[PDB]
A = this chain, B = another copy of it.
Amino acid sequence: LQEMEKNSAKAVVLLKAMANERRLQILCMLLDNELSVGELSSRLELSQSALSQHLAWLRRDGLVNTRKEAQTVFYTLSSTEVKAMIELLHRLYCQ
């Protein structure tokens, strides 16, 4: 069974994208919500740069969508997989 290899390939792309405290926090705060870079940096207490690297990771692997308004960059959860995963992690670890 090596279809498990491609399945685990994409799945591990997702997990590696999520296997980080800051990135996981970002993803958790973006669930059922839409936040900006300033809001994320404020609620997570991070510099916009240290936040920008993580957001760059999330954008590159297609876990988040970006929308520009004025001088504000809004982020949202992108794929259904990351939405479901974040929901499950939220139910298991946040309530």
Contact = CB atoms under 8 A, between A and B. Distances in A.
- Chain copies in the assembled complex: 2
Interface of A: 1, 4-5, 7-12, 15-16, 18-21, 24-25, 28, 43-45, 80-81, 84-85, 88-89, 92-94
Contacts of A94: 4, 7
Nearest to A22: B8
Contacts of A4: 25, 28, 94
A19 B13 CA distance: 8
B88 A92 contact: no
B12 A20 contact: yes
A81 B10 CA distance: 20
A45 B11 CA distance: 19
